[PDB]
Amino acid sequence: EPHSLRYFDTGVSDPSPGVPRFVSVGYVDGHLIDHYDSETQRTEPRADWFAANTDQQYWDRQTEISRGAEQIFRLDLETLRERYNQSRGSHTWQLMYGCDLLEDGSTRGFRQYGYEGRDFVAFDKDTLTFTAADAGAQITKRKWEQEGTDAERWKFYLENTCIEGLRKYVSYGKDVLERRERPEVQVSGMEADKILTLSCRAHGFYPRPISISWLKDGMVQEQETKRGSTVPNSDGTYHIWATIDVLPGERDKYQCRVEHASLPQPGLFSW
Amino acid sequence: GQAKAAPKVQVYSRHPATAGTENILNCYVEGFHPPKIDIALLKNGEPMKDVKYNDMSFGDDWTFQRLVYAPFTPTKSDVYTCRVDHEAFTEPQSFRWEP
Amino acid sequence: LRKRQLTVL
């Protein structure tokens, strides 16, 4: 029941393969919905459920805004290089903004900036204040706090326009966003030196949240479990692994336990 | 200082591995900054066919992620790796698909 | 839908 709309704008001073000079991308509930970059010079849809509910006027508006951002990012990279007394080279400037609809029906708004991979400045729409996360951002906090009309336009957008769009987009995406795909689980084992490494892998599940654990005689072995981060497949489903090292003679005591929204009860799996 | 965050890499198959059965090999690279990176899928150290490279995605902590994937039919003996070059590493790092 | 950026550093 929670939802999110987020835009990420990223500029680099020294482009490379896969890293255009400027990119702007949108995400709904973590799903990529559109893309602009400095090479294409236009914003296009990246999910057919989004494409089927938008039109040329919509994309031309996103393109005009993204072209404006691209111009601003080129100026800001040079402002930041001078702010920090840096040489020319490889630098990154980033913005993330957007809005959340939470489980209680309440909303949150975001507008935050990162320079060189570090928090720089962030806007609090509830208070109309900027917070400098780095000393070199205090000059910017003072400049941008004098721009009251612009702050009010951001507040109105984050609280109204952004959420109004998110609620529509969640409706456009219902068939994809609300789907459930079960994990396909495999247990494998490797004996090395009177150590047996048991591996449990869950494949192809959706949505992303999952619980995977190793049990000994039904008892969770949390301190002994190694687990990977949840990572995506090419079809937008997910994968996770968990391992445990056990005495080969005790192999029959161990089961992998998987819990997921697609499953009507916990999955229990033996090697 | 500028973040110099090392890529964290996982190499995994789309479906449970069965020697001889059609599958997809995935390399997911995350946690890194700056965004410049080179990722290759290799079979016995040589370039794999039919690789797709998804556009990078973006974290709220100013790190990036990339998924790279290709068709494969895993055998008992073949060695599949993901080779990653990033400024956080002195030399490119290899990550093995565990059979 | 995006927000227009109207200020520079």
A36 and A167 share one domain: yes
B67 contacts A10? CB cut-off 8 A:
no
Q: Which domain holds residue A225?
A: 180-269
Contacts of A209 (CB under 8 A, 6+ apart): A230, A260, A261
Mutate: best of A58, A154, A158, A164, partner C, most C CBs <10 A: A154
Cβ count near B55 (within 10 Å): 15
* Two structure tokens written together for B36: 């410049």
- B55 contacts B97 by C-beta, under 8 angstroms: no
Whether a cis peptide bond, with omega within 30° of 0, leads into A207 is: yes
Shortest Cα distance, chain C CAs vs residue A225, angstroms? 43
DSSP-assigned states of every residue in chain B:
----BPPEEEEEESS---TTS-EEEEEEEEEEBSS--EEEEEETTEEPSS-EEPPPEE-TTS-EEEEEEEEE---SS--EEEEEE-TTSSS-EEEEPP-
- A7 contacts A154 by C-beta, under 8 angstroms: no
User: Cα separation of A260 and A238, whole Å?
Assistant: 12
DSSP, collapsed to helix, strand or coil, labels residue A135 as helix
A84 and A155 share one domain: yes
A90 contacts B62? CB cut-off 8 A:
no
User: What experimental approach yielded this model?
Assistant: X-ray
A168 and A218 share one domain: no
Interface of C with A (CB under 8 A): 1-9
Q: Does B81 touch chain A (CB under 8 A)?
A: no
A63 and A151 share one domain: yes
Cβ count near A64 (within 10 Å): 13
Interface of A with B in 140-169 (CB under 8 A): none
A165 and A185 share one domain: no
Residues of A with CB below 8 A from B53's CB?
A: 18
Task: Name the residue facing B62 among A18, A94, A185 (closest C-beta).
Answer: A94
Residues of B with CB below 8 A from A17's CB?
A: 38
Domain end, chosen from A179, A199, A214, is at A179
Q: Does B22 touch chain A (CB under 8 A)?
A: no
Residue B55 phi, psi dihedral angles, 5° rounding: -60, 150
Contacts of B77 (CB under 8 A, 6+ apart): none
Shortest Cα distance, chain B CAs vs residue A150, angstroms? 23
A52 and A125 share one domain: yes
User: Cα separation of A43 and A58, whole Å?
Assistant: 10
Chain centroid to Cα A97, Å, comes to 12
Domain end, chosen from A133, A157, A179, is at A179
User: Cα separation of A178 and A3, whole Å?
Assistant: 12
A117 and A226 share one domain: no
Domain end, chosen from A179, A202, A230, is at A179
Binding partners of B (≥3 Cβ pairs within 8 A): A
Using CA atoms, how far residue B54 sits from A1, A235, A238, B69, B85, in Å, is 28, 11, 15, 8, 17
A33 and A49 share one domain: yes
- B24 contacts A239 by C-beta, under 8 angstroms: no
B14 contacts A234? CB cut-off 8 A:
yes
Helices of type H across A28-116: 48-51, 56-83
Residue A75 phi, psi dihedral angles, 5° rounding: -65, -45
User: Cα separation of A68 and A6, whole Å?
Assistant: 18
Chain centroid to Cα A48, Å, comes to 20
Residue A137 is given by DSSP the state G
Binding partners of A (≥3 Cβ pairs within 8 A): B, C
User: Do chain C and chain A touch with ≥3 beta carbon pairs under 8 Å?
Assistant: yes
User: Cα separation of A192 and B84, whole Å?
Assistant: 28
A26 contacts C8? CB cut-off 8 A:
no
Task: Name the residue facing A69 among C1, C5, C9 (closest C-beta).
Answer: C5
A40 and A107 share one domain: yes
3-state secondary structure A201-225: EEEEEECCCCEEEEEECCEECCCCC
Interface of B with A in 29-48 (CB under 8 A): 30, 33-38
A86 and A129 share one domain: yes
Question: How do beta strands A196-205 and A219-220 pair?
Answer: unpaired
- A31 contacts A47 by C-beta, under 8 angstroms: yes
Residues of B with CB below 8 A from A6's CB?
A: 60
Provide the b/e sequence for C1-9 (b: ≥16 CB within 10 Å).
bbbebeeeb
Shortest Cα distance, chain A CAs vs residue C3, angstroms? 7
How many domains does chain A contain in total?
Answer: 2
A192 and A260 share one domain: yes
A100 and A169 share one domain: yes
